[PDB]
Design a binder for this molecule. Structure first.
Ligand code: A1A0U
Ligand code: CL
Ligand code: ZN
Ligand code: ZN
Length: 309
């Protein structure tokens, strides 16, 4: 029998049927399933089991693969894998999606988004899982996302919360956003964001509107105008409270629709390819135009410098 924490460095161990896996190894999982209360079977010899990082070597390996120090991570990860592996991951419109189960609509929408933006995860667990998931095997990636976000299967989620959590574990250091807020009493004031903060915004969905200028409260009492001075990033995420919004073809990359409230709701994913495709888990519907309660819109960027002198 073998044990590991990353499924990359494996360790050979001893087969003894009298003691539960929990008494010999500690908490043990086989392909997600909690076998801690189980004693070893004759058919298990040679398989790979996961265990918690109790050995100092396993601590190091788990940190290098998952980029977290949380001891419970693996536990949570494995618990999530017990469900994500049962889900169906149909190909829909050239992307990997999830047939609806366990309120996963936010997860399916985040999954489709991740497959359409240029992102480079730093943790190897995530890089490996990402490439597997882009090809259709997305159980591990979804379990890892649930784990990194401290969400459980069935638990309610926000697509923006998920994307932001994950961006933290991505190489966005080269990203840069220069803004300029212009109040008529306070004057002009410029700011520069780098990293994760440069690729997200909250307040408006329209990126063209962010470039033209958006009204925001100022402390003096007036409304100030914030406009985008410079964007250096592979993508940009714009969020806003759900509202009826008209997605025009060729003007965005993809978008999150949300119907419902803080208690109960359902997420749909819209993407602009050669026309507007609406991916509701395993369901797909095409349309030339789309109007819906949008809350996230994702745009592609390379380098932008404002024309406002
Ligand atoms: C009722 O939804 N309102 C929302 C909201 C509010 C204010 C916002 C302000 C923004 O900045 C200007 C940007 C985005 C905003 C989004 C979200 C969007 C939909 C998904 N989440 C989940 C959160 C966990 C659980 O409660 C289920 C819903 C709620
Ligand atoms: Cl409802
Ligand atoms: Zn002011
Ligand atoms: Zn309800």
């Amino acid at each position: 029998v073998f044990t590991t924490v990353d499924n990359i460095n494996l360790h050979t161990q001893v087969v003894d049927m009298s003691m539960t896996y929990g008494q010999q190894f500690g908490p043990t999982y086989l392909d997600g399933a909690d076998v801690t209360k189980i004693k070893p079977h004759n058919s298990h010899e040679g398989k790979t089991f996961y265990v918690l990082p109790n050995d100092d070597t396993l601590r190091v390996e788990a940190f290098e693969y998952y980029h977290t120090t949380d001891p419970s991570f693996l536990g949570r990860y494995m618990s999530a894998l017990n469900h994500t592996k049962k889900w169906k991951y149909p190909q829909v419109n050239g992307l990997t999606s999830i047939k609806w189960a366990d309120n996963n609509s936010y997860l399916a929408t985040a999954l489709l988004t991740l497959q359409q933006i240029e992102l480079k995860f730093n943790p190897p667990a995530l890089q490996d899982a990402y490439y597997r998931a882009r090809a259709g095997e997305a159980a591990n990636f979804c379990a890892l996302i649930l784990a990194y976000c401290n969400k459980t299967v069935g638990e309610l989620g926000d697509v923006r919360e998920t994307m932001s959590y994950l961006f933290q574990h991505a190489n966005l250091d080269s990203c840069k956003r220069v803004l300029n807020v212009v109040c008529k009493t306070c004057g002009q004031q410029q700011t520069t964001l780098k990293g994760v903060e440069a690729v997200m915004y909250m307040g408006t969905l329209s990126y063209e509107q962010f470039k033209k200028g958006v009204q925001i409260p100022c402390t003096c009492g007036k409304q100030a105008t914030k406009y985008l001075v410079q964007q250096e990033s592979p993508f940009v995420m714009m969020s806003a409270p759900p509202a009826q919004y008209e997605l025009k073809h060729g003007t965005f990359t993809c978008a999150s629709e949300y119907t419902g409230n803080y208690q109960c709701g359902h997420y749909k994913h819209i993407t602009s390819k050669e026309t507007l495709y609406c991916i509701d888990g395993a369901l797909l519907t095409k349309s030339s135009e789309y109007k819906g309660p949008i809350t996230d819109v994702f745009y592609k960027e390379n380098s932008y410098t404002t024309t406002i002198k």
